[PDB]
Design a protein around this nucleic acid. Structure first.
Ligand SMILES: [Mg+2]
Ligand SMILES: [Mg+2]
Lengths: 114, 1208, 115
RNA sequence: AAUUUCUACUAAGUGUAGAUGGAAAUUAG
DNA sequence: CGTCCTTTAGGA
DNA sequence: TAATTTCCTAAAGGACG
C-alpha cells in the first residue's frame, strides 16, 4: 500500500517548498545589501518545517545579488558577491550567522528585518 | 478698482465643517469601562420607535380635530374663484379671504385640546403612557425619561405643520392650496359632464359601499370640501377615482373607471378628474433579496399571469375596434413610429403636413413663429387614435398587426430569456458569494428585469392619459388589470439596484450623548457646567473636552502657574437673537431686581407699537432704545465683557438697527489659560474625556496646501477675525462603526514597487517605505464631530445682486465673458472673450492640470472616462459599472469649479451657462443632463463664498473676505435667465453657425418628391459654376424659401468649398466639387452656362433628385465628425467673409490664440458668449431705473441680427 | 485507497495553484495599466491545464489592481477599476475578449507583454 | 492607494491637487 | 440652595 | 431623487434632594 504514493508526496513537498521560496524571493529582493541576511544555502530543497539543523555541512554566509534565470523563472541566488560566482537556488534565513545555527528566521522577522 | 472689489460682505451663510475626533490618552478605555457606548446606541435604536409612536399619537390628534373643523368662509370663496377674476384689483381681497381660510383652519390646532401639552415634556411622561396598552410599548417610553429635551429638533420639525407661511410642510397650505384648488377643479369637471353618469350602473353600488348616506352628487358640490380634509375622506375620494376593494378580489369599478368604461362612442379627447394630496424590498440581507426575487418574480407569480393574460389579450387585439386605441404623445412617438415603420418622426411629419394644410395658408413660406407654435401645440395636443395611425400609414398597411406581432414577439423574447435562465429559479438555490461581489447571479436578474421593464416601457405609451372619454373597452379592461400587477417589477428593479450598488463601507452612525440631553449646546463661558464641552488649543493642535455626568464642574479651579505646559481655553459666549433674547431677559422677573414700575415702557412693549402696526414715534421706539441701552449698562454679566460703543440717539431711526448693532457686537472669543499637568491628571482619573479634533492637515507631515475647511477652522481663532466668521453652537458628535472587518482588509505591502495609474505621471514606479491600506478609515471605530460655523452673520454692503451686476456692467466699458458649454470630443470647452468679441483664450478641459510647488502634472479625464465606459461595455452586470461613471462625473465637476473660480477673479467676468429647461439636445453629448444640473448647483454654491486657498486671508478674495457674487440656489426649475453673475442662456442656433459670417443652414433639404425638389430649385436664383474659383456659386434668397423668417440678410452666396463627411453606420468622406461633377456627368448636363435652373428642372427621374437632395444637404453641414476618432472633426464655412476667404477650423486649431473658435465645440462656447455680449449691449440702451426689467431671454431673430452684424 | 489519495492529490493541486498565483502576482505589478491582460476570475481554484473553457460561468475582463490581504499574504485581485469592489482570489490569463474566450495566455506571453 | 467625506491619485514619503452644509421632518415622482 | 432639565421669545 | 421647511441658543423657571 506504499508503492507509488511516495512519489506523490515527494512531489507535493516540492510544490510546497517552491511556494515558500517564491513567497520569499520578493522580500529578498526588497532588502538593501547591508541588510542581506544569513542563509543556509543548499541548491537543494530543504524543508522549512524542520530545517534539518543537525548537519553543519551547509555553510552560513551572507546572501548577495538575487538575479533571475533567463531560461526558466527560477530565483537564482549568489553568496557573498558576484566574484564568488556561486549560483544557488535554495536559501532559508536564520540567525545562524557564521556556523552557529540556533533559531529560525520566519517571514515576519525577515519583513521586519528591513 | 475692480468690479469684484465691490462684491464683498453681502449676506449670511451657514456651513458645517466636520472633523474626526481622536481619543487621547486612556479616554477610549474610559468610555469602555465606564459602560458608556451601548447606552447611546440603544438610545439611538428606539428613538425612531418612540418617534413613530409619537407620530401615531399626532395622527390620532389630527383625526380627532379634523372631525370638528368648519371653514365658514368657504361659501364665498367657492364663488369668487368661480368668477374668472380678471384681477382688475380684485384678487388681493381674494388672497385676504384665502389667508383667512388658512388661518382659521389653524385655530382648532393651535387653540384647543391643550396644544401646550402637545410639544412640552408632558407628552412622553404622561400621555404616551396612556396612549399605549402593550407592556413592551410602555417599556420604550419609560426609557427616555429625563431625556425629553433631545426632541426639540423633532418638535421644531413638528411645529411647521401647524403654521401659515405658505410652505409645503404645513397642514394649512395642504388643506387650502393643495386641496381646495383641485377640489374646485374636479368640481367643475364634475359639473360639466354630470349628465353623463346615470343611476343604475355606478350609483347603485357607490351609494352603499362607500358611505351608505349622502350618496355621491353632493361631494364635488360646494360645501363638502369640509369633509375631504382627512385621510378616510380622501380614501373615499381615491376609491371613487381608483376603485374600491370591498375586502375581496373582485375589485369593482370606480367613477373614473366609469369614464374608462363609458367608451362606447370611440372619440375621447376630454380630461378626467384628478387625485388629491394628503399628509402623515431587500436592503436587509442577501437571502431576503433572493426570497423576494424568486418568490415574487417566479413564473408562479401573478405578474407572469398578467403577462399570459396580455398574450391572450393581444391574440384578440385585431378583433376590437381599430379606432379605440389612444396612445400618449411625448417622448414615445419617436420610437413608436420607428418600430412600426422604421422612420423616426414620420407620424409627427404626417401631423405636421396636416396642420400645414389646416392652419397655414397656400403661401410658399412657413412662418418660423408658426413653426414654434406648431411645436408647442403638438406638445399640447393630447393623443392620437389608432385610426389616425391608419390614415398616416399608406395603403396595404393596417397598423394594429405590427403592434400585436411585435408585442407578442417581445414577450416571446421575455419567454426565451426566461427559459434560458430557469436554472436559477429553483427555490432552494444556494449562493456562493456576496451578491455585492457576485456576478453570475446578478446578470440573470439583470437580463430578466430589463426584459420585463422594457416591455413595461413598451406598453407605458399605450394609455393616452388613461382618464379619457370614448374609446375601446374590453381590450382595456384586461389591459389595466394586467398592467397594475405588472408595474411592481420596476419598484423591484429600483430596490435591487439599491442592493447590488451597496456601499462596501457603512456610514451608519449615531448621536453621542454621555448621559446628557443638554450635550453640546454651544461654545460659551458659563455654560461649560451644562453643555460640558470646551475647546482647548495647544500649539497648533486642537482638542475637544467632554467631562462626564457626575463630575460636572471639573473645569473651574485651574490656573496658569507656568509648569511649562498650558493648554489654552476658549470662552466669551454669544447672544442668540437679541430681538428675541432681550425681552427674554429683561421682563422675566429681572425688571423688579434692577428697576421698578416706570410703566410707560411696559405699555409700549405691551402694544407692540415699536414694531410695525405702527410706523414708530421718536419717543415710542427710542424709549425702548434708551431703556435697553441703559438697562444693559448695569448688567454685570455682559456689560463688562462686551464694549457696547454705541451710536447716538438719532441714528436708530428704527428698532432693527440697534438689534443689528447688538447682533454685530456679542461674540468676542479669546484665550483662557489652564495648565497641563492637572488637566492631564483629570484625564487620567477619568473625569474628563479628551478628544483631539483631527484631519489630514493637522499632522506634522502635511506640508502641502491645506483643506479649505481646515483653513476656516484655523481662521476661526485668528487675530484678524473680528466678527466675520463666528463659531456658532449646535455642534454634535457621531461615531461610525468599524465595518471593514479585520479578516477582510486588503493592504499594499511595504517596500514593494507599486506602479502609477496616471499615464502622464513622468515617474513610472513608486516604492513605499511603510504600509498603506485600502479604506482603513472604515476599519476603526471612529468618532466624527460636526461643528456649524456661520459665515458673515452681520453684512454691511446690502443690496440686491441681480440689479447690482447690471448697474455695474452698464458703467463698464470692456466686460469679459466666460462661456462654458458641453460637447462630444471635449467635455467642457472654455472660451473667454472681451467686450468687442475678440477671443482672448480658449482650451478644452479633457485634461486638468494640477500644479504644485511650480510643478504641474496634467490629469486627463476623457481617456479615463473612456476606460470606464469600455469597462461598462464588457461589464456583464451594468449596475456597479454605471454608478461609478455617475460618481466620476460628480468627481469631475468638482475640479472644473476651481478653474472657473480662478478665471472669474482672473478676468472680472460673468459666466454664461447653457440652460437646461428649454432644449432637447442631441442625446449624444458626453456630459448628460443629470450631470449638468448637478454642475450648476455646484457652481452657485461655490460662488456663494468664492475663496482661493493660496491667498492672504486678510486681503480681499481671502477666506475672511470671500466674494458672494450670487444668490442661494433654490431649485432646478428656478434657474431662469439671471443669477448673480451666472447667466443662463438657451442653446438654440449656437452650434451650427459660422463665426466669421453669421450664416446658418436653415433649410429643409431632405428628399420627398420631384416637383417639391423643382420648387426648391426654382426658389434658387443663380446656380453658376465660377471657373477661376472652381466652385458653384448658389445665390439664394431666404424670402424665396419656407421657414426662413428668422434671418437678417436673406441673400447668401453658397459654395462647394472643401470636403465633407457623409454618414452612410459607416464613414464616408467626400470632396464636394468632384461629387457635383460626377452627378452632373452621370446625368449629362453642360454646367458651364452660369444659371442653369431650367436645366435642373428638366430631369424626370427619381434617381437624380433623390441623389441631388443628399448632396445639396451635405453642402450645408459644418458639423463634420466621425465619432470614432477624437482628432478628426472640423467646422467649415461655405460662405465667403467680408474679405472673401472662407473659414476652415484647420487654419485656426494650429494657432496660439485664434481670433475665431478652434473646433466645433469652441464655436458653441463662443456663440454662447456672444449672446451675453449682446445682453451687455442691451444693458447700455436702457436706463438705471428700468435696468431691473430688461428682457434677456433673447429671441432667435435678434440673435441672428447680432451675429450677422458682428463682422460688419 | 483510490478515493483517498484523490482526496489528497486535490490538496497537491492547490499547492500548484498557489505557486501559479504568486508567480502571476509578481508580474502583473510590473506592468503599465494599458498593458494588463484579460483574465478569467473565480473564487474556487482554477487549473490552468484544462480550465473546462466551454463552461458558461466565467467571463474575460481586464485585471486592475493586484493587492494582498492583511493577516495572510494571499494575493487577491481587482477586476476592472478599484471602485467596482470586485475582489477575486484566482485569475488565469487569457487572450479572449469578454465572453468568447480564445485560449489561455501563457506565462512568457505575459512576461513579454511588458516589453 | 492612505482621506471629515467624495474624486483623481502617489504628487518625494503616514501623504498631493481640487471641492464638500450638516442633523431631522414632510410631500411628490 | 445647588443640580439638573424644560421652556422660552420673536426687529425689517 | 428632488422640493420645502425647522435648527446652526443663552438664560429664566422650576422640581427636587
Ligand atoms: Mg492639501
Ligand atoms: Mg479611490
Amino acid at each position: 500500500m506504499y508503492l507509488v504514493v511516495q512519489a506523490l508526496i515527494r512531489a507535493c513537498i516540492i510544490k510546497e517548498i517552491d511556494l515558500y521560496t517564491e513567497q520569499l524571493y520578493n522580500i529578498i529582493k526588497s532588502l538593501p545589501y547591508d541588510k542581506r541576511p544569513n542563509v543556509v544555502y543548499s541548491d537543494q530543497p530543504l524543508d522549512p518545517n524542520n530545517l534539518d539543523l543537525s548537519e553543519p555541512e551547509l555553510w552560513a554566509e551572507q546572501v548577495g545579488e538575487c538575479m533571475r534565470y533567463a531560461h526558466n523563472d527560477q530565483p537564482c541566488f549568489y553568496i557573498g558577491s558576484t566574484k564568488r560566482e556561486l549560483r544557488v537556488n535554495y536559501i532559508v534565513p536564520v540567525i545562524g550567522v557564521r556556523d552557529e545555527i540556533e533559531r529560525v528566521m520566519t517571514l515576519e522577522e525577515v519583513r521586519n528585518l528591513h | 478698482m475692480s468690479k469684484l472689489e465691490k462684491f464683498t460682505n453681502c449676506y449670511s451663510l451657514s456651513k458645517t465643517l466636520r472633523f474626526k475626533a481622536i481619543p487621547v490618552g486612556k479616554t477610549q478605555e474610559n468610555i469602555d469601562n465606564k459602560r458608556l457606548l451601548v447606552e447611546d446606541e440603544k438610545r439611538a435604536e428606539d428613538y425612531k420607535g418612540v418617534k413613530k409612536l409619537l407620530d401615531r399619537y399626532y395622527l390620532s390628534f389630527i383625526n380627532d380635530v379634523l372631525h370638528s373643523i368648519k371653514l365658514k368662509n368657504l361659501n364665498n370663496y367657492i364663488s369668487l374663484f368661480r368668477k374668472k377674476t380678471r384681477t382688475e384689483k380684485e384678487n388681493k381681497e381674494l388672497e385676504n379671504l384665502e389667508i383667512n381660510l388658512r388661518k382659521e383652519i389653524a385655530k382648532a390646532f393651535k387653540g384647543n385640546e391643550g396644544y401646550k401639552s402637545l410639544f412640552k415634556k408632558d407628552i412622553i411622561e404622561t400621555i404616551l403612557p396612556e396612549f399605549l396598552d402593550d407592556k413592551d410599548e410602555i417599556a420604550l417610553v419609560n426609557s427616555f425619561n429625563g431625556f425629553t429635551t433631545a426632541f426639540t429638533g423633532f418638535f421644531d420639525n413638528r411645529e411647521n405643520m401647524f403654521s401659515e407661511e405658505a410652505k409645503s410642510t404645513s397642514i394649512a397650505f395642504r388643506c387650502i392650496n393643495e386641496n381646495l384648488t383641485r377640489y374646485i377643479s374636479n368640481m367643475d369637471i364634475f359639473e360639466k359632464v354630470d349628465a353623463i353618469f346615470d343611476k343604475h350602473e355606478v350609483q347603485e353600488i357607490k351609494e352603499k359601499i362607500l358611505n351608505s348616506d349622502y350618496d355621491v352628487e353632493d361631494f364635488f358640490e360646494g360645501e363638502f370640501f369640509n369633509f375631504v380634509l382627512t385621510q378616510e375622506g380622501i380614501d373615499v375620494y381615491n376609491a371613487i377615482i381608483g376603485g374600491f376593494v370591498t375586502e375581496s378580489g373582485e375589485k369593482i369599478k370606480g367613477l373614473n373607471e366609469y369614464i374608462n368604461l363609458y367608451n362606447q362612442k370611440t372619440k375621447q379627447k376630454l380630461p378626467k378628474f384628478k387625485p388629491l394630496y394628503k399628509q402623515v424590498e431587500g436592503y436587509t440581507s442577501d437571502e431576503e433579496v433572493l426570497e423576494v426575487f424568486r418568490n415574487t418574480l417566479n413564473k408562479n407569480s401573478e405578474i407572469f399571469s398578467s403577462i399570459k393574460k396580455l398574450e391572450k389579450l393581444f391574440k384578440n387585439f385585431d378583433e376590437y375596434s381599430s379606432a379605440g386605441i389612444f396612445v400618449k404623445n411625448g417622448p414615445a412617438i419617436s420610437t413608436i413610429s420607428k418600430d412600426i415603420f422604421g422612420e423616426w418622426n414620420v407620424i409627427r411629419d404626417k401631423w405636421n403636413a396636416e396642420y400645414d394644410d389646416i392652419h397655414l395658408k397656400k403661401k410658399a413660406v412657413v412662418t418660423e413663429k408658426y413653426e414654434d407654435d406648431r411645436r408647442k401645440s403638438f406638445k399640447k395636443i393630447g393623443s392620437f387614435s389608432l385610426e389616425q395611425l391608419q390614415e398616416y400609414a399608406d395603403a396595404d398597411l393596417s397598423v394594429v398587426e405590427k403592434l400585436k406581432e411585435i408585442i407578442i414577439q417581445k414577450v416571446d423574447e421575455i419567454y426565451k430569456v426566461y427559459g434560458s435562465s430557469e436554472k436559477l429559479f429553483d427555490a432552494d438555490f444556494v449562493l456562493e458569494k456576496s451578491l455585492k461581489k457576485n456576478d453570475a447571479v446578478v446578470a440573470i436578474m439583470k437580463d430578466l428585469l430589463d426584459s420585463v421593464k422594457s416591455f413595461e416601457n413598451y406598453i407605458k405609451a399605450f394609455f393616452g392619459e388613461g382618464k379619457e372619454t370614448n374609446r375601446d373597452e374590453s381590450f382595456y379592461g384586461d389591459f389595466v388589470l394586467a398592467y397594475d400587477i405588472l408595474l411592481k417589477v420596476d419598484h423591484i428593479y429600483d430596490a435591487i439596484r439599491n442592493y447590488v450598488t451597496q456601499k462596501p463601507y457603512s456610514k451608519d452612525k449615531f448621536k453621542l450623548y454621555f448621559q446628557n440631553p443638554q450635550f453640546m449646546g454651544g461654545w460659551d463661558k458659563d455654560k461649560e457646567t451644562d453643555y460640558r464641552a470646551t475647546i482647548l488649543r495647544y500649539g497648533s493642535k486642537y482638542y475637544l473636552a467632554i467631562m462626564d455626568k457626575k463630575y460636572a464642574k471639573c473645569l473651574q479651579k485651574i490656573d496658569k502657574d507656568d509648569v511649562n505646559g498650558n493648554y489654552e481655553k476658549i470662552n466669551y459666549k454669544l447672544l442668540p437673537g437679541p430681538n428675541k433674547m432681550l425681552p427674554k431677559v429683561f421682563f422675566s422677573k429681572k425688571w423688579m431686581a434692577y428697576y421698578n414700575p416706570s410703566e410707560d415702557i411696559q405699555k409700549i412693549y405691551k402694544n407692540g407699537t415699536f414694531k410695525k402696526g405702527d410706523m414708530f414715534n421718536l419717543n415710542d421706539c427710542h424709549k425702548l432704545i434708551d431703556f435697553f441701552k441703559d438697562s444693559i449698562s448695569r448688567y454685570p454679566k455682559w456689560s463688562n465683557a462686551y464694549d457696547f460703543n454705541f451710536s447716538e440717539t438719532e441714528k436708530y431711526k428704527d428698532i432693527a438697527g440697534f438689534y443689528r448693532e447688538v447682533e454685530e457686537q456679542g461674540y468676542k472669543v479669546s484665550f483662557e489659560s489652564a495648565s497641563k499637568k492637572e488637566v492631564d491628571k483629570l484625564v487620567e482619573e477619568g473625569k474628563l474625556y479628551m478628544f483631539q479634533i483631527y484631519n489630514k492637515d493637522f499632522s506634522d507631515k502635511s506640508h502641502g496646501t491645506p483643506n479649505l475647511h481646515t483653513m476656516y477652522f484655523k481662521l476661526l481663532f485668528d487675530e484678524n477675525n473680528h466678527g466675520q466668521i463666528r463659531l456658532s453652537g449646535g455642534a454634535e458628535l457621531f461615531m461610525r462603526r468599524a465595518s471593514l472587518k479585520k479578516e477582510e482588509l486588503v493592504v499594499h505591502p511595504a517596500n514593494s514597487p507599486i506602479a502609477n495609474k496616471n499615464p502622464d505621471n513622468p515617474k513610472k514606479t513608486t516604492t513605499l517605505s511603510y504600509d498603506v491600506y485600502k479604506d482603513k478609515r472604515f476599519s476603526e471605530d471612529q468618532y466624527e464631530l460636526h461643528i456649524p460655523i456661520a459665515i458673515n452673520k452681520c453684512p454691511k454692503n446690502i443690496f440686491k445682486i441681480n440689479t447690482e451686476v447690471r448697474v455695474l456692467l452698464k458703467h463698464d466699458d470692456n466686460p469679459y465673458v466666460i462661456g462654458i458649454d458641453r460637447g462630444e470630443r471635449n467635455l467642457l470647452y472654455i472660451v473667454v472673450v472681451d467686450g468687442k468679441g475678440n477671443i482672448v483664450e480658449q482650451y478644452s478641459l479633457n485634461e486638468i492640470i494640477n500644479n504644485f510647488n511650480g510643478i504641474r502634472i496634467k490629469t486627463d479625464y476623457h481617456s479615463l472616462l473612456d476606460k470606464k465606459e469600455k469597462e461598462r461595455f464588457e461589464a456583464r452586470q451594468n449596475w456597479t459599472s454605471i454608478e461609478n461613471i455617475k460618481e466620476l462625473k460628480a468627481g469631475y465637476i468638482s475640479q472644473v469649479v476651481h478653474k472657473i473660480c480662478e478665471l472669474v477673479e482672473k478676468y472680472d467676468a460673468v459666466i454664461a451657462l447653457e440652460d437646461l429647461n428649454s432644449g432637447f439636445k442631441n442625446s449624444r453629448v458626453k456630459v448628460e443632463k443629470q450631470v449638468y444640473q448637478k454642475f450648476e448647483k455646484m457652481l452657485i454654491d461655490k460662488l456663494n463664498y468664492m475663496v482661493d486657498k493660496k491667498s492672504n486671508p486678510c486681503a480681499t478674495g481671502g477666506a475672511l473676505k470671500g466674494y458672494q457674487i450670487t444668490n442661494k440656489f433654490e431649485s432646478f426649475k428656478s434657474m431662469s435667465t439671471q443669477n448673480g453673475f451666472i447667466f443662463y442662456i438657451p442653446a438654440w442656433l449656437t452650434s451650427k453657425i459660422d463665426p466669421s459670417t453669421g450664416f446658418v443652414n436653415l433649410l429643409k433639404t431632405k428628399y420627398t418628391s420631384i416637383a417639391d425638389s423643382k420648387k426648391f430649385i426654382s426658389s434658387f436664383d443663380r446656380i453658376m459654376y465660377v471657373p477661376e474659383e472652381d466652385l458653384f456659386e448658389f445665390a439664394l434668397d431666404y424670402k424665396n424659401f419656407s421657414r426662413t423668417d428668422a434671418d437678417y440678410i436673406k441673400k447668401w452666396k453658397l459654395y462647394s468649398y472643401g470636403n465633407r463627411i457623409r454618414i452612410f453606420f459607416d464613414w464616408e468622406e467626400v470632396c464636394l466639387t468632384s461629387a457635383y461633377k460626377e452627378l452632373f456627368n452621370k446625368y449629362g448636363i453642360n454646367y458651364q452656362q452660369g444659371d442653369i435652373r431650367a436645366l435642373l428642372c428638366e430631369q424626370s427621374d427619381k434617381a437624380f433628385y433623390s441623389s441631388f437632395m443628399a448632396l445639396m444637404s451635405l453642402m450645408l453641414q459644418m458639423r463634420n465628425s466621425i465619432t470614432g476618432r477624437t482628432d478628426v472633426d472640423f467646422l467649415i464655412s461655405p460662405v465667403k467673409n467680408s474679405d472673401g476667404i472662407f473659414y476652415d477650423s484647420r487654419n485656426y486649431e494650429a494657432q496660439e490664440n485664434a481670433i475665431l473658435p478652434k473646433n466645433a465645440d469652441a464655436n458653441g462656447a463662443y456663440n454662447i458668449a456672444r449672446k451675453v455680449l449682446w445682453a451687455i449691449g442691451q444693458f447700455k440702451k436702457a436706463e438705471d431705473e428700468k435696468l431691473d426689467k430688461v428682457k434677456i431671454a433673447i429671441s432667435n431673430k435678434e440673435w441672428l441680427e447680432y451675429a450677422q452684424t458682428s463682422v460688419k
